[PDB]
Chain length 311, copies 2
């Protein structure tokens, strides 16, 4: 069990558990140039036949943030040539966009980068986008929702497969990725992504997580188990909320005399769906109309018409 097979085993296990690839023929990689990116690529090129892929291409986005950006682009191009892959390069001033839209560098960078990735996907005929997102990114994302406000969804964080996007390194942790690259003698760059990181995420990455790991050395392995438990529990809650939904709904209304007799958890789930809103505040405000007539406005109206309810 060396650094290489440790990653490959987790990638293959993800495929068996989620069917990341199941018909796609042309994959576009979100290639920033960092270790994550390089290892993802080295892995996909190694398992290309295994997944029945016909084309794996790179897409590098130049954020114009710093001089190293040009250095990054050059590395990406040379990397494409050494690997004999096609590469698509894009460019947009992220810092500028962030300022005229009163948003952070992280969300501006994310927005422009994927806009670019998605444009190449359509004008070049790709079936999906492979991202180097991993277990440590998931842990950081989970902790950021715990901190800012969340329910089961935020805690579980992003999924391995998500409409057009694929995250093959989902089970792999940052350190295993670094050990993979060193072991195989790969080369990488400190891509511009490191300089867009939001302050909240840096606090969690370089201050909170290190402290938590001093309590539990294998935080990532432990966290992954929580995610798996949470995802099965969420799946169950969703399946049940759905049965009750198509059992209490009729037209554009909800049978209040039926819903009210159900478990609190399902009452909220049914309501979340019926009104397309996750806000803890809006859900409960609407939920109260299950016990006392009245109306609720969110930009749409919910009236209690004896036993029924519209919106």
């Amino acid at each position: 069990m060396n650094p290489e097979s440790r990653v490959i085993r987790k990638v293959l296990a993800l495929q068996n558990d989620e069917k990341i690839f199941s018909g796609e023929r042309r994959v576009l990689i979100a290639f920033s140039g960092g270790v994550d990116s390089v290892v993802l690529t080295d892995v996909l090129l190694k398992l290309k036949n295994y997944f029945s892929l016909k084309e794996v291409a790179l897409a590098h986005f130049n954020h114009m943030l710093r001089e190293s950006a040009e250095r990054d682009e050059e590395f990406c191009k040379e990397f494409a040539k050494e690997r004999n892959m096609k590469i698509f390069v894009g460019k947009e001033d992220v810092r500028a966009f962030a300022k005229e839209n009163r948003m952070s560098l992280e969300e501006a960078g994310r927005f422009l980068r994927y806009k670019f990735l998605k444009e190449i996907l359509e004008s070049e005929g790709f079936d999906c986008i492979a991202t180097a997102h991993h277990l440590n990114d998931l842990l950081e994302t989970s902790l950021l929702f715990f901190t800012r406000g969340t329910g089961l969804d935020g805690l579980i964080g992003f999924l391995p497969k998500e409409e057009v996007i694929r995250r093959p390194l989902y089970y792999v942790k940052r350190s295993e990725i670094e050990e993979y690259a060193k072991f195989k003698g790969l080369r990488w760059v400190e891509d511009e992504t490191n300089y867009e990181v939001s302050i909240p995420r840096n606090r969690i990455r370089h201050r909170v997580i290190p402290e938590l790991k001093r309590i539990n050395e294998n935080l990532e392995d432990t966290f992954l188990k929580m995610v798996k438990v949470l995802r099965a529990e969420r799946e169950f809650l969703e399946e049940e909320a759905q049965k009750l939904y198509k059992e209490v709904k009729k037209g554009n209304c909800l049978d209040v005399k039926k819903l009210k007799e159900k478990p609190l958890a399902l009452q909220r789930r049914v309501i979340r769906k019926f009104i397309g809103e996750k806000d803890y505040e809006k859900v409960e405000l609407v939920r109260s109309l299950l016990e006392k007539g009245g109306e609720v406005n969110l930009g749409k109206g919910k009236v209690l018409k004896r036993k029924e309810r519209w919106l």
Copy 2:
């Protein structure tokens, strides 16, 4: 809304909702002497009739850990005397007990203290014990579970009503406990309870939470909404699980053909209660039997035979 009504409204909301008190007539307060204790007591004296309580008494435990122990105990006796309340006092050499049983001062302290409280509950005829555990304590516990590994049942932390123990301040924030004390002129003394706090818990209390608050200064309020949401989802899971348990559990084995088709989330809950030991790796190991399996071992054994066993 002043500092008093801010705490009382949260306590009232807890009662009218979960019935923390529903028949108990005599309550024993775990009175350390610090703000938490002092405020808990003041709140229970104000709501004593509302809760239909006949008597509220104090119980103070001297840990003999600091030369201020006697002054502290005296303060507690005078606290009771002034409000015409009964107070029970305990005293144990926690250091000696810790060395004797090879345990830390923290776990030794907590052990002896609760033994003391429970001894009084029985020999004096009290119905329940009221503790000053609040929202910040829950937040701490929640992060500890996130860190050491858990699922849904741990992210919650503890409950407001836990057999014999009641926690009226469940939803109250520490800062609200302190403002209440100031506003009402409540004086307090050193809280020996803080000598029962372990290293990991101190790290989360003094290092992690303060950092997370530099992201969301309203963390506690945010965490509250999450608890209320998860809390209900857990109740529903626990509910559906127990239900399934009786249907599959028959004698001392599990109807595999039937359990095998239930949702993954419920399978884990049933197994957790069947094999007593609830640990991700144990449960998953056993759950592998349901679908074409041989036999597994741990502290006991189990065999798949169209039905199920346990030897």
